[PDB]
């Protein structure tokens, strides 16, 4: 079918916990953007607890009409909370400099064990498990023999290219994981750093399953609202794919 | 004549600082701010730079339609800067340990020369000095003394009560606050704090100017926009005013 959107709200938080307020509310843009087509809901919980709570996660799996993909980092903490949370998706991400590459994905090729681990407890609570790697062919590969069913490729370098010439290798880069990930049987996603003037050329990709996109979304969201930033970069994304 | 409607654009650049990109842009925020109907645009540059830069500062300068008010912390550095900018309205705020009170506001009365000579030089530049004081009556004395011909009132605690009787109680010292800064000749502000919900019974107060809010239009911006975030909140303010 089409290619996928999955709202991140993290920085709705990043606002609210600017202040120490209740608004705010990443569970209401979460609510509003699904009203407003957003096939899934992000939300990261960091170690750091830097925007999202507990409590944002909890009262998202009361309330969402969609589906939660939660991002985490490999701790025993996260794992656990996500054994009682139980999301529909879920996906590793690196917070330590430990997991961390160069470029910023999570060093699933490094840590494959630790990563095993966590994907099959994760299955086993029935989520649908990505990891966030680079656009590396050797990132690609290791996540297949993790068993892990999907991964999201790294936009950042992409989306940080200065001149045009860059932005078309790394555009070229994210274009090759795509084939390499669906050629192993993976599901393939992306989205960081994507915004409303970058989007198109990543969601015209053959193959990409879903960008889950979040920043530039809630950034935009302060000019039109929730509603109409989520609609429009659904828009986007879909007369793109076509 | 009416209330006046100060919108500060501070916790926009709180999220871009967040990613480190161009957007959301502040001054776009001011711009649709001024164009919603905002009387003025309050930017506090912080000796940190949290959030606001010096480039959001000039390039405010250059594009504003209506007014700057200028919140800053009284260093050497911060009032040449100011002086070259030369806003139309400033606002001194504590940043420091020293000029901090408990409640929140500067301490006017432990650095009254240290303050007045703040006020003479921005007074030189032109710009109407407005302090950001509690409303406490010692404060509010020392600010005539300097020759300060505006005051800010924190209104946190009156926003930050959890019962009703905390409230009431909180909104009587801004009422006496307000009462004694006009006998003494002064302008007198409020809005720090302030939200939707609890906005106009300040709103309604006798002799209250303008009201300064940034954080609560922020936030409530990313469900409508700004646009309608700051027509809003001036609806609400003059119908309680009046």
């Not at 998202?60 to 991002?71: D, G, I, P, W, Y």
């Not at 996109?213 to 986007?236: P, S």
């Amino acid at each position: 079918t089409r290619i996928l959107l999955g709202v991140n709200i993290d920085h709705v938080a990043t606002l609210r916990q600017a202040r120490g307020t209740r608004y705010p509310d990443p569970v209401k843009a979460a609510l509003d953007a699904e009203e407003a087509g957003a096939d899934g809901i992000t939300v990261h919980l960091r170690e750091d607890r830097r925007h999202i709570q507990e409590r944002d996660v909890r009262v998202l799996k009361e309330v969402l009409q969609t589906r939660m993909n939660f991002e985490m980092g490999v701790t025993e903490e996260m794992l656990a909370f996500a054994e009682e949370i139980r999301p529909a998706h879920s996906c590793l991400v690196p917070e330590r400099r430990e997991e961390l590459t160069t470029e910023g994905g999570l060093d699933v090729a490094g840590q494959e064990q630790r990563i095993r681990d966590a994907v099959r407890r994760l299955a086993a609570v029935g989520s649908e498990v990505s990891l966030f790697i680079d656009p590396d062919p050797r990132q690609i590969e290791a996540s297949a023999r993790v068993g892990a069913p999907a991964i999201e490729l790294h936009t950042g370098r992409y989306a940080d290219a200065e001149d045009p010439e860059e932005q078309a290798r790394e555009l070229q880069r994210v274009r090759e994981g795509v084939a390499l990930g669906r050629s192993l049987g993976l599901i393939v996603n992306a989205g960081h750093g994507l915004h409303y003037h970058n989007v198109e050329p990543v969601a015209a990709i053959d193959g990409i399953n879903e960008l889950n996109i979040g920043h530039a979304i809630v950034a935009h969201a302060l000019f039109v609202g929730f509603r109409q930033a989520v609609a429009e970069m659904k828009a986007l994304m879909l007369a793109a794919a076509t």
